[PDB]
């Protein structure tokens, strides 16, 4: 639970702080495990808290579904690696080989993580296919956990100052308006999700593609475009059941849209 910093041998960059593939090899023969290690590169007390958030957060939840916390090192948050990375990738580089069943698995372990984070009162912000691993070509997990936030117990959503640096496509129309997020505002990004998930993340027809084409600042655009009861299309072949639990997901309030233990069930009963 406590790495040892000059034991924790760097190997690559695994992307955006930074997330680094490191090899804590105490016997520096180059046989001990790889990890995933996170750290911030710019100091202020802010992002630093921020980080410390994230780590508490992390440590905390044991699921099948999220990304392992594997410990610190005092500075770097160490967390189980996965090799075959995010699913976005996964989805793009396995297109050919991968039908609707697993599609449908993956949504429903997405799911099941995402119904543990809302029972611990995380909200976590960031869902997209960009910020899931893949475990292996039958398990995904929830990564990514620098923007989420805890629920006090007395409120069930958050306003954040400023708004999001993350790409707008994937926010509720609550967040694009009033910075508002919430475990209902993780659900319409779930509902991104499937979407990235039934297109394999094709870029041509991604969300940001997608959107751009369908759409003064390109926000206000894509909100009016949203307000006006305009959605992404269905995906190519994409079944016709999916199609409506992503509809669902993007109904325009947010208490209309259904809670995660509602949607796992109906994923399974498809799968
Ligand atoms: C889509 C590219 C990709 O594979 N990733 C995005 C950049 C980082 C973020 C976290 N990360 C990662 N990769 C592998 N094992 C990990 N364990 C924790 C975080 C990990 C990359 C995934």
Redesign the pocket.
């Given at each position: 639970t406590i790495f040892e910093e000059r034991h924790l041998k760097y190997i690559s960059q695994?992307?955006?702080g930074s997330?680094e593939?490191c090899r804590y090899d105490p016997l520096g023969d180059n046989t001990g495990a790889l990890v995933?290690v996170?750290q911030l590169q710019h100091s202020g007390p802010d992002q630093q808290r921020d980080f410390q958030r994230e780590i508490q957060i992390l440590k905390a939840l044991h699921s099948d579904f999220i990304?392992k916390y594997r410990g610190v090192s005092y500075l770097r948050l160490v967390?189980?690696?996965?090799?075959?990375?995010?699913?976005?990738?996964?989805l793009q580089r396995h297109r050919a080989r991968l039908d609707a069943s697993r599609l449908l698995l993956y949504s429903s372990q997405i799911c099941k993580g995402m119904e543990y984070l809302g029972s611990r009162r995380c909200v976590h912000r960031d869902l997209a296919a960009?910020?899931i691993?893949v475990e292996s070509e039958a398990h995904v997990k929830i990564?990514?956990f620098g923007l989420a936030k805890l629920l006090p117990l007395d409120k069930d959503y958050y306003v954040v100052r400023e708004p999001g640096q993350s790409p707008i496509f994937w926010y509720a129309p609550e967040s694009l308006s009033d910075n508002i997020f919430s475990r209902q505002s993780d659900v319409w990004s779930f509902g991104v999700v499937l979407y990235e998930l039934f297109t394999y993340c094709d870029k041509s027809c991604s969300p940001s593609a997608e959107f751009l084409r369908m759409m003064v600042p390109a926000l206000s655009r894509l909100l009016e475009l949203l307000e006006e009861g305009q959605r992404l299309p269905a995906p190519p072949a994409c079944p016709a059941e999916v199609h409506e639990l992503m509809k669902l997901c993007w109904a325009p309030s947010p208490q209309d849209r259904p809670s995660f233990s509602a949607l796992g069930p109906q994923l399974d009963m498809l799968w």
């Open positions: 695994l992307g955006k997330v593939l995933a996170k990304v967390m189980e690696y996965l090799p075959s990375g995010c699913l976005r990738d996964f960009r910020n691993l990564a990514d």
